[PDB]
Design a protein around this nucleic acid. Structure first.
Ligand SMILES: [Mg+2]
Ligand SMILES: [Mg+2]
Lengths: 239, 239
DNA sequence: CGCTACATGTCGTCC
DNA sequence: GGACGACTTGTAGCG
């Protein structure tokens, strides 16, 4: 029980309970391969008929059921649920949460494998090419937006909404930027347009919105043009 | 290669290679508990240092690296990626994707366990309490909105944007509905306000927007009132 | 906790 | 294929 991994194929009920319960109390990762039915009631409600899936219960409460396809678990519960194995006509893995109140029930018809992974990880993801990274590049070197641009505020509350960057231009105007790290879609324009209508109300018609992004969709460009907003092409930088 | 599950703890290199290549070829699920490093370059860029993780490869090319916390894999590749094992100074799992170009590299420093799960699942999820379900309700029972409300279109392309439900009211006004399955946000009122604007362009002052959802955030309420749009509290049905 | 907006979002789905 | 919007979205950042 200090070995990183413990594994049992075609486990007996005793062995199942032993590992399942040990991992939950040991703050370790539980992985299971089983034919199962799944029952979810919570924010929404779902039923999943009998079939083979991979099941993961992380020490933080995260509960995953993965089918042989997609990138998303077919069913899940997010970090913070309380999980318990429950012996019934079949074993039943049960995830409970109270805000919001949600129940996830996994019923194990046949467990092919149960396993305990006592995983030691002190390390964190270091990612670049984000919106945050664009915002940094614009404050270090405002030249990328345009000559004379002076950035002032990052993630600024206005009365309704939060603007990514608020600044001033060489004509002394108020400028709003909305940044997108990938091709900007319609809703980016709605955001930007919303912010700009709001500030025009205090500061006048001279306020400029600019959408900053590596490209636009057609609809983006269309609404951006209909509304008299602007576009500066900027790629998110990779450190 | 017949049994539903194969497990080899502390595999050797030939064992590792043998199992991984069987997995991929057989359209089984590959599961590896391992100490690894992860290198990602693609839409964005990252480096994950040495640590214990659960790696999954699904037969449709989904590639997941899970740490012992949260619901999201720390690194991942969506379906369609092409996976393979390469023998470098360490064995290295490699995920390539074209359109967009992405590389995901998982360097296996030490593999505690490796497993192949030849998994059979023919059943899909059946979910209720969605936005679709709300819309079906409104079409079966429009009086849930208001008496003398006639629905016409669902998920209808307006000039710019797609409206959720479009119809008329008893007084000859045009009615846009924006539906939400949970408490509505600023995002929701911006959507509504956009649609209502684009439709006033044509049919004039005869357009009403109605935001339909179980509740509203403060800001969404604030903004709703300001631009003079309306609200019907409605919960999605669970059937 | 509630609000706001990003994400390597992923995923269905209308033209 | 490109555009567009939902999702049990999850997740961080702030107040
Ligand atoms: Mg923003
Ligand atoms: Mg909508």
């Amino acid at each position: 029980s200090k070995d990183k991994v413990t594994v049992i194929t075609s486990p007996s009920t005793e062995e199942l309970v032993s590992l399942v319960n040990s991992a939950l109390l040991e703050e370790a990762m539980l992985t299971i391969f089983a034919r199962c039915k799944v029952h979810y009631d919570g924010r929404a409600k779902s039923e999943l008929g009998s079939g083979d899936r991979v099941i993961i219960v992380k020490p933080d409460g995260s509960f995953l059921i993965h089918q042989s396809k997609k990138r998303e678990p077919v069913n899940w519960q997010p970090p913070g649920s309380r999980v318990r194995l429950e012996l019934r006509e079949n074993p039943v893995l049960v995830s409970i949460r109270r805000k919001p109140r949600e129940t996830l029930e996994v019923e194990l018809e046949e467990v092919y494998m149960v396993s305990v992974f006592r995983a030691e990880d002190y390390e964190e993801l270091a990612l670049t090419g984000s919106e945050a990274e664009m915002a940094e590049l614009i404050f270090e070197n405002p030249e990328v937006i345009e000559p004379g641009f002076k950035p002032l505020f990052r993630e600024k509350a206005i009365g309704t909404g939060i603007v990514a960057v608020l600044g001033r231009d060489s004509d002394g105007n108020i400028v709003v930027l909305e940044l997108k790290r990938r091709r900007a879609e319609l809703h980016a324009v709605r955001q930007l347009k919303s912010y700009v209508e709001i500030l025009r109300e205090e500061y006048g018609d001279k306020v400029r919105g600019i959408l900053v992004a590596p490209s636009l969709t057609s609809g983006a460009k269309r609404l951006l043009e209909k509304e008299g907003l602007e576009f500066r092409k900027l790629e998110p930088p990779k450190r």
